Amino acid sequence: SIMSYNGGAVMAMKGKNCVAIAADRRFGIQAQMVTTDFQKIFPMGDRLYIGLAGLATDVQTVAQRLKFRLNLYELKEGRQIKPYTLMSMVANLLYEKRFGPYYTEPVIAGLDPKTFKPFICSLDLIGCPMVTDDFVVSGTCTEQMYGMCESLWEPNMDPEHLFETISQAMLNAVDRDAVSGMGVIVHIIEKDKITTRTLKARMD
Amino acid sequence: QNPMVTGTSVLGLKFEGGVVIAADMLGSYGSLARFRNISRIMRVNNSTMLGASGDYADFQYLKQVLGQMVIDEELLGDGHSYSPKAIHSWLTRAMYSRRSKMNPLWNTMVIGGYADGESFLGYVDMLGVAYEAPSLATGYGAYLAQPLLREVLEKQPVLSQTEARELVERCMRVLYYRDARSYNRFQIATVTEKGVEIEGPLSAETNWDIAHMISG
Amino acid sequence: TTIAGLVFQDGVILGADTRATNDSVVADKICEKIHFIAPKIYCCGAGVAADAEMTTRMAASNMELHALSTGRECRVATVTRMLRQTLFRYQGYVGASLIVGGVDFTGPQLYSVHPHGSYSRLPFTALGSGQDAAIAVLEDRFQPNMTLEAAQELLVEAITAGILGDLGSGGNVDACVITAAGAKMLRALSSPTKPIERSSQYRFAPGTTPVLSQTVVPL
Amino acid sequence: MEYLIGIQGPDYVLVASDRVAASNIVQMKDDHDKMFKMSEKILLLCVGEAGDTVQFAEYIQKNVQLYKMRNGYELSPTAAANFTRRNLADYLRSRTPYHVNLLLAGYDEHEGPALYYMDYLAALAKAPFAAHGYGAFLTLSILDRYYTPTISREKAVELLRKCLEELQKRFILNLPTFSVRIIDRNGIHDLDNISFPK
Amino acid sequence: MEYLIGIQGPDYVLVASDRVAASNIVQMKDDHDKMFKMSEKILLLCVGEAGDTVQFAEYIQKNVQLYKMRNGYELSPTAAANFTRRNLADYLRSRTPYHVNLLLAGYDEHEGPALYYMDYLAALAKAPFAAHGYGAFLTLSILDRYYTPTISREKAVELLRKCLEELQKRFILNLPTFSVRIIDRNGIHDLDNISFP
Amino acid sequence: TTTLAFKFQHGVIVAVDSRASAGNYIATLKVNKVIEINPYLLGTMSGCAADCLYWERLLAKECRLYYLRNGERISVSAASKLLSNMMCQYRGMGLSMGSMICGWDKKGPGLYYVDENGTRLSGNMFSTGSGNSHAYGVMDSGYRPDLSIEEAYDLGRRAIVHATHRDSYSGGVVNMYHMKEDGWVKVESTDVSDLMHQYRE
Amino acid sequence: TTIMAVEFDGGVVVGSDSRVSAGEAVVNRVFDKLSPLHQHIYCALSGSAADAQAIADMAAYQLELHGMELEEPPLVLAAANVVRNITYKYREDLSAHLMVAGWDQREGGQVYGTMSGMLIRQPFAIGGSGSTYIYGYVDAAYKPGMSPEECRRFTTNAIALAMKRDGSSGGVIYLATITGAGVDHRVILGDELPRFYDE
Amino acid sequence: TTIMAVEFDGGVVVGSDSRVSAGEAVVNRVFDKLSPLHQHIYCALSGSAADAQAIADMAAYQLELHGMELEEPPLVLAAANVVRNITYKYREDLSAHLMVAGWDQREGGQVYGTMSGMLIRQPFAIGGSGSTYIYGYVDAAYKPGMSPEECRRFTTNAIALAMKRDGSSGGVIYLATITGAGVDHRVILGDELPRFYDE
Amino acid sequence: RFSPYAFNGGTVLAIAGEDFSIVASDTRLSEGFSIHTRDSPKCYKLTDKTVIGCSGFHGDCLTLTKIIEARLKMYKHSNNKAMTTGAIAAMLSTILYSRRFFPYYVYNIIGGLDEEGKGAVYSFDPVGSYQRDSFKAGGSASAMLQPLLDNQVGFKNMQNVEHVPLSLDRAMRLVKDVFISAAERDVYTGDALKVCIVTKEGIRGETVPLRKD
Amino acid sequence: SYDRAITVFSPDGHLFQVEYAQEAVKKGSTAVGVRGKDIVVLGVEKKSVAKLQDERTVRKICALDDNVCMAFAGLTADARIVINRARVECQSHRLTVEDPVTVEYITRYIASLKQRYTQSNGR
């Protein structure tokens, strides 16, 4: 379709007290690569991230609107945004476009600023909010990432095991996808700190 | 392709020691109800029973061909009679060979039969898709009376002859309610070891008294 | 998608299926289709995923302004008009197909709203992709003036026949019972397929990850 | 289709482009210069539909020159890239879609050299080297093989001549003459035009 | 599109063609020779769809060579032109249409030099000079200016170099190298390939 | 799908990648595109995988019928003509195949390119497939007829390695087939990803 | 869908079927196609239900103001025009078709076909996709000057002939007898439907 | 185009209209749609005239050999099948539709709808584009065991209702009474056509 | 008009071990959103050592299977021996190709043991191309199955881990679990499972229960 | 058409039609040839020359291709067929194989024609 123009993959898996979000680095036009430095995962502030997939125009277009609406929300409010409220923002952002929709499927992952509470979710072109207690995926390879996340995911996992789980989930799911690849960036959101790692993946 | 006198849903379900097939008596041209008395259930030899959906003009062609197939078989008197699995696998090829020539017979058929103590209820299709199931329906019967049959067969996989017809009368009653091209008169043809017996035109006692509930 | 509703002696009962699918995949196995309009009024979306949600949000918000404005129990006939004039305003482009039901002091009332705005009062109905399966079970076993204890099984058996017999319906069965007291919600009332077990854990030992750029940001 | 290329050295950004302006089966203008100067150290390279390239890239050249006069300092190559995107992106869904392909090449006192890729859907990418057109398939392969981050401008021009002379063998369109420019701390500097007198 | 040209002098027929074989955006074969020799003094030049040129022009080369062995004498350039037409014409309405563009260049002991034009609809024309392809628009104008029936081989090659070097300026496709051949009473003779390095 | 071949002093070298995909989802990975025909004849694969695989089996069939009948050990030039004549009868019916035929005959290290519509081209250097353009760049980077054996393979590797890196429908492992007077021999089968981080360091 | 109206001395009898069908499947089995626009005025819905229920509600609104502001029951000619203006203005977007029948203190029983934005007064009117089959019954069996007991038996016999031939029609017949005294709403159940040649 | 046939004791009455219309204009004003396939057998043409006259002639030929070779009048079931085989074989190319009615020494009066390649025996049959307008008269007014004088008045009254509603039908009614004694041809002129409700 | 091909769903999975080859498929036959029947085995038996799956239009799965089983006898009568696994692939490559201009829509996966006694899986395409591989999939769930096998079977994307040839004891639980994972997330898979294991001893058919919805 | 067995076996196993055909060769115009080193020579004697004949049109030494020539002795009406059939094969060979025709390749095709016409129906 249109979302298959630039390809791309985004994944989020929820652990016990921590979440992890990953996406590939490839930017290309149909069958032709351009650069491996592209960024599909964007900071929403401390312990909250959002991934974006689909057409690469709307990835950067929708993201610049969120940091626009987020910074307004965080300055008005005296507190940081809750990850649950952010889901409804991006849902309202995409739904106002219902008749000229952005092509993208946001993936939200983070922690409730209250104490430990993790949260993840995914959206659609129209922005139907969908909350899951396990994982969410979006992209052209989504069909691959279902089977990988089904078998590997467990109810409660410590941060060490999230990374190993989400690493092999992307690396194996992307190798069978033609338009995605060229390295994977994996973020880890803990209560204490944040660990970012760029994996070494097959260049192809 | 051309809209020539389609049929309607054909219900069937295998009970203990027999198979029952119910079909409307209504031929339907477009949205009309035009021919209101027709027999859409053909008797094939002694032990097998056919009824169909879709184009009726293509059903009398198969009525004529299968007529010769069975009659030519009786003429030899070899003792061999086509089992309902052969009639089923023969139609599957006729439906398919017409398909691969891009001149298909637009039809859907349900072959009932009881042979060697084994009740055969079977299904074919225009495109050649064919299978065998404990309960079958065609057209919108598969969307309506099919979950009525499956809901019974999951709880009671073994149905008697009396419970069968009662459940068929209920499912034909629901089609009369919920199907636009259906009609009240229908035939219930039950094949058993005693041979094919086609009951006369029947009807359904209907309860419309909910029309008063909607008013208030 | 299969949603259904039934009227009994004292009130109404609204069921729904929990599975939501895009193309052919299962996106989420637990989803709430029954929404909350008024304390005694509910509804069930079937259609485009967000179009059946955002639509019930606008109605649930309008009925809250109306309930605070008047100070009176919300009438079921009002919610139907709001959903009816909203969907018809969009010329059927919205694909939300709703079943509105609830008990006001006029007595139990159950409507249904089609995506183009066509709404019919009736005792029972079902919408969605599995509507043809649920209605067929309602037609046969229905009869006026049912007790509550006998009215739950007929709806469960109506949706279960729509789940097991359709590729677009799955998961548990949500049900919402409404009476003079009203507002009693039963989530995941029925589970047609119990077993979900997946034992052979693929969990592996950490330490094999050809990783390069690792860095840590304190907080 | 018209051809663009760029190369980022440690201290410099070496860009080149074809000088051909073609319509139907003939070449109208062989000296046509596709290199648009946004600011002192900032260039721009636009190819695409014949009318959309000059029309759009002039809307940028004025907004960049206007910013320098308002605040007294020119845009950095980073801000100038994200500005060209949002304008090209907002067009897409409006009634006047632009079809263009951009290369933003610039040098900065702090960030240093920068080279940006952009397609007609306004997807911005920062790459060490990039190319546009059908000649981008026959070239970027050569750039992959001889490029190094430590390359020197003496090698770069020599490296650029290896790429551009292979459009004369495999690539079907003529493209006889190629313009070449280099950017450094001292600003833009022209280099001897690569010319193959067929 | 590929490029053909021909010129008829009083004693000679000077033909030339581009050597490029191109597919998609790249040039596969730069030395590809499009000049097919039907008989001793009879050449043929075929451009068009990549597969139809070699497939059809080989059906002619065999029928011409076969005629010379049957009757002991080769076809004249006139009969060979009307034979290529009827085959190309009969294939129009059948289920295998050929898309080709031909130039039949030959010399005859009596009729003398001859040059024939043909399109993909098999309409035969005998012209003093002709060309095919998109390069035929930028060239035949130059041939109009400098051509004369009394032209000499020495001038013809010099005249041919004026035409072919103007495909390097206006014409968009590369076409770096051009094959050139000349026909006279002594038969076909190759000439130094025009090449623009 | 990326494929290339070139000839020099010591004979032909053929290089392909392994990957063949349908749409965005990669069907298989290690698929061998190069098709063996005779001992000294070597074909390639481009376009529809089943079409060129089928018709180059007929060429393998016709080359044997020729060698059994005449015993003259068919030359590369004629074997290229048989594959074109078979594809010309079915023209218009949608057969999509590219191909190249390599080998050493009495004349020399012949190399040809046979296409779906009958295009037949001899020559020194060829490449086909979707990533063909990316191959010519590295191959034209100073390849010369005077290269030695080791210097020639290094070009064959580095051509496909950079060809599949830029192309999303090309990848997998590089298959390299050297050619000699006696017959072809497989040089190597090596992963692209492992060669990338070599040339990258 | 089959709707019918008959005119007699004291008032009119408005008949209709029930079944609403989308495609070849039945959405609603029992559905009331008579939507009162005003106390004595009734509108028989036809065509697209979503478009007809919108026009029937807009016509019941614009006419409601007409009833209040005049402080007097509106005529049937007023009801037929409010329906006609809405139908003709949107006729591209709205495929609906209505029929307006009722009683007034001036002219008595009236029946107006609103089809496709036009307007006629008719002694009897039939509408819907099931109308066409009963164009032979209503021509022959109809006679002028029928008593209310004869009209209800004429409307019942007619629609009962349409439901059997039409696949998009069926169910129970609704009958509303509108006279000066009030409105008598009846329902004819399947067992009361007049039997006609079965085969 | 409207054709009709009714069965009674001694024989059958085959009615038809006349007018043949291509589009909205009338090709032929008076046209005989009854083409005898044999002495006592008559076929009522319907649908495309060019396709029906071809099938009616091919059926009159194949059946003529059947009459000579048996040296005996053919049945009506034989005539209905010859028409059915031609209609079903060419059903893509030929849009024609026929109706076969006649009398035999065995079963007596018989009427067979051949529509679209199928076959049914019917007590009364109607066909053509104008038949859709009356299913309500033939359901109600029909009664079993009617005398030949009543059947001709039933067929005449019925078609007269179809010609008024149908735009593609009209003209004079043809009536052929086929009994064991022979065939009575009758033509009903416009002044003899039974008058029905005018408005 | 007339659409000759409909998608009936179905999923096929093959794994070639050292001594074994497993071919498994679900039973669900469904056109559109409706389920015709919950038992419709995709796996069909050719010879004792060869099981063929057919995933695609069910009418072609039934026709192509009767054509293959017809040419198995044409071969067995002419050559007086059963077709080898490699010969069935090469034959069915030409069978599928003779339809080139009106193709069968099906995905055939042939598996079993070769002359060497080792698991040989041949995956096809509707046009008749074939290549040998250790593990293949097909149908609607093919995209979900392949990445799981690249990890467990192929040991890819893991640095410094031993390569042990897959064992049948791990292969049984590997085929069952990917379907328990696929039948959940795929609407065209479920209602039952058939596993046909092909070893040197013989074919052993094992049925597994899946989510019924 | 006319399909009947002309050439058939005999109680002695001999083919009469093939033996009687060779009887036509047994009275020919004598044709000879020898092989040298780089040269090869053919010759034929003509007793039918009355000096009124045109020697060019009666020449029985023909040329199938540039690299191959041939002669014949027998009934001359039949040679014009085989020769015109052989010359078609020479050119169809250069169309199939870009190389010229091997002397052996055209000798096989001449022999495969004399076979088919032995076993064909009504020849």
Swiss-Prot record, chain A:
Q: Name one GO biological process term.
A: proteasome-mediated ubiquitin-dependent protein catabolic process
Question: Subunit structure, briefly?
Answer: The 26S proteasome consists of a 20S proteasome core and two 19S regulatory subunits. The 20S proteasome core is a barrel-shaped complex made of 28 subunits that are arranged in four stacked rings. The two outer rings are each formed by seven alpha subunits, and the two inner rings are formed by seven beta subunits. The proteolytic activity is exerted by three beta-subunits PSMB5, PSMB6 and PSMB7.
Keyword Acetylation tagged: yes
Q: SUPFAM superfamilies per the record? A: N-terminal nucleophile aminohydrolases (Ntn hydrolases)
UniProt entry keywords in alphabetical sequence: Acetylation, Cytoplasm, Nucleus, Proteasome
Q: N-acetylserine (modified residue): where?
A: 1
Q: What is this protein called?
A: Proteasome subunit beta type-3
Q: Name one GO cellular component term.
A: cytosol
PANTHER family registered for this protein in UniProt = METALLOPROTEASE TLDD, PROTEASOME SUBUNIT BETA TYPE-3
PROSITE patterns to which the protein is assigned, alphabetical: PROTEASOME_BETA_1, PROTEASOME_BETA_2
UniProt xrefs under InterPro entries: Ntn_hydrolases_N, Proteasome_beta_3, Proteasome_bsu_CS, Proteasome_sua/b, Proteasome_suB-type
Q: What does this gene product do?
A: Non-catalytic component of the 20S core proteasome complex involved in the proteolytic degradation of most intracellular proteins. This complex plays numerous essential roles within the cell by associating with different regulatory particles. Associated with two 19S regulatory particles, forms the 26S proteasome and thus participates in the ATP-dependent degradation of ubiquitinated proteins.
What family, per the record?
Answer: Belongs to the peptidase T1B family.
The subcellular localization recorded is: Cytoplasm; Nucleus
Family annotation (Pfam families)? Proteasome
Instruction: Give the sites modified to N6-acetyllysine.
Output: 76
Task: Please tell me whether the keyword Cell wall biogenesis/degradation is annotated for this protein.
Answer: no
UniProtKB/Swiss-Prot annotation, chain C:
Q: How is it modified after translation?
A: Autocleaved. The resulting N-terminal Thr residue of the mature subunit is responsible for the nucleophile proteolytic activity.
One of the entry's Gene Ontology molecular-function terms is:
endopeptidase activity
Q: Which family does it belong to?
A: Belongs to the peptidase T1B family.
Q: Which residues carry this modification: Phosphoserine?
A: 191
Name the encoding gene, please: PSMB10
Kindly list the GO CC terms recorded for this protein: cytosol; nucleus; proteasome core complex; proteasome core complex, beta-subunit complex; spermatoproteasome complex
One GO term of the biological process aspect: T cell proliferation
| Residues of the whole record sequence present | 40 to 258 of 273
Name the source's superkingdom: Eukaryota
Q: What induces it?
A: Up-regulated by interferon gamma (at protein level).
Where found? Cytoplasm; Nucleus
Q: What does this protein do?
A: The proteasome is a multicatalytic proteinase complex which is characterized by its ability to cleave peptides with Arg, Phe, Tyr, Leu, and Glu adjacent to the leaving group at neutral or slightly basic pH. The proteasome has an ATP-dependent proteolytic activity. This subunit is involved in antigen processing to generate class I binding peptides.
Q: Which reaction does it catalyse?
A: Cleavage of peptide bonds with very broad specificity
Location of the active site: 1 (nucleophile)
Keywords, alphabetical:
Acetylation, Cytoplasm, Hydrolase, Nucleus, Phosphoprotein, Protease, Proteasome, Threonine protease, Zymogen
**Could you identify this protein by its name?**
Proteasome subunit beta type-10
Query: Which residues does UniProt call coiled coil?
Result: none
The record's principal subcellular location, in a coarse class, is cytoplasm
Q: What does the record give as EC number?
A: 3.4.25.1
Q: Which organism is it from?
A: Bos taurus (Bovine)
From Swiss-Prot, chain D:
In terms of superkingdom, the source organism counts as: Eukaryota
Provide the protein's localization. Cytoplasm; Nucleus
GO terms for biological process? proteasome-mediated ubiquitin-dependent protein catabolic process
A cellular component annotation (GO) from this entry? nucleoplasm
**Keyword tags:** Acetylation, Cytoplasm, Nucleus, Proteasome
Q: What main location does UniProt list?
A: cytoplasm
Is the keyword Cytoplasm assigned to this protein?
Answer: yes
- Record-linked Pfam families: Proteasome
Q: What does this protein do?
A: Non-catalytic component of the 20S core proteasome complex involved in the proteolytic degradation of most intracellular proteins. This complex plays numerous essential roles within the cell by associating with different regulatory particles. Associated with two 19S regulatory particles, forms the 26S proteasome and thus participates in the ATP-dependent degradation of ubiquitinated proteins.
How is the quaternary structure described?
A: The 26S proteasome consists of a 20S proteasome core and two 19S regulatory subunits. The 20S proteasome core is a barrel-shaped complex made of 28 subunits that are arranged in four stacked rings. The two outer rings are each formed by seven alpha subunits, and the two inner rings are formed by seven beta subunits. The proteolytic activity is exerted by three beta-subunits PSMB5, PSMB6 and PSMB7.
Q: Which family, according to the similarity comment? A: Belongs to the peptidase T1B family.
Query: What is the protein's given name?
Result: Proteasome subunit beta type-2
Q: What is the lineage of its organism?
A: Eukaryota, Metazoa, Chordata, Craniata, Vertebrata
UniProtKB/Swiss-Prot annotation, chains G, H:
Please provide the Gene Ontology terms (biological process) for this protein: immune system process; proteasome-mediated ubiquitin-dependent protein catabolic process
A GO molecular function for this record? threonine-type endopeptidase activity
**Residues annotated with N6-acetyllysine modification:** 33, 89
Where it sits in the cell: the answer is:
Cytoplasm; Nucleus
Enumerate the Gene3D superfamilies for this protein: Glutamine Phosphoribosylpyrophosphate, subunit 1, domain 1
Cystine bridges: which residues? none
Record keywords, A-Z: Acetylation, Cytoplasm, Hydrolase, Immunity, Nucleus, Protease, Proteasome, Threonine protease, Zymogen
Database matches in InterPro entries: Ntn_hydrolases_N (IPR029055), Pept_T1A_subB (IPR000243), Proteasome_bsu_CS (IPR016050), Proteasome_sua/b (IPR001353), Proteasome_suB-type (IPR023333)
Q: Which GO terms describe its cellular component?
A: cytosol; nucleus; proteasome core complex; proteasome core complex, beta-subunit complex; spermatoproteasome complex
Q: Which CDD domains match?
A: proteasome_beta_type_6
Induced by what?
Up-regulated by interferon gamma (at protein level).
Q: How does it assemble?
A: The 26S proteasome consists of a 20S proteasome core and two 19S regulatory subunits. The 20S proteasome core is composed of 28 subunits that are arranged in four stacked rings, resulting in a barrel-shaped structure. The two end rings are each formed by seven alpha subunits, and the two central rings are each formed by seven beta subunits. The catalytic chamber with the active sites is on the inside of the barrel. Component of the immunoproteasome, where it displaces the equivalent housekeeping subunit PSMB6.
Another remark in the UniProt entry says: Encoded in the MHC class II region.
As for family, the record states: Belongs to the peptidase T1B family.
The organism named in the record is: Bos taurus
